């Protein structure tokens, strides 16, 4: 998992129904967030974007976090 | 829906300065060409064999410079490896 690096981030929002996880990711020239959606394409976005905080946060609790 | 063809994680690999540098100049992102900007630093590795290599195992990469999208060899070498 620490083995990629993103280039370059998207420029819009993605729709949060398509989303199923996310990763972060110096080492990399860029900090990042890599959401997975669900027919499992990882996508390279801006950590500073509020929306994507805002989709970290929903996929948080989306889950129970176990233990 | 339309990701973007520049949206895709990059394969890398690390050197001894935990700086990482990028593995070739482009793959397939999103059914697109994914190209790096000219003049960046790259390893002259393709990606089946990136795909291949021992992880965390220190190999001398072969550097390059990306010109339009591949590797140009710039017969130098340093330290490098691929993360777990």
Redesign the interface.
Known sequence: ???????????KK??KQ?LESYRRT????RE?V?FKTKLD?????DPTQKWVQDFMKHLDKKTQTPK | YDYGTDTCPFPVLANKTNKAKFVGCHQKCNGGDQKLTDGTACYVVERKVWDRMTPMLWYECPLGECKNGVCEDLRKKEDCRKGN
């Open positions: 998992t620490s083995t990629t690096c993103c280039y370059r981030f998207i420029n993605i729709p398509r110096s080492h990399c020239p990042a890599i394409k990882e996508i390279c976005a």
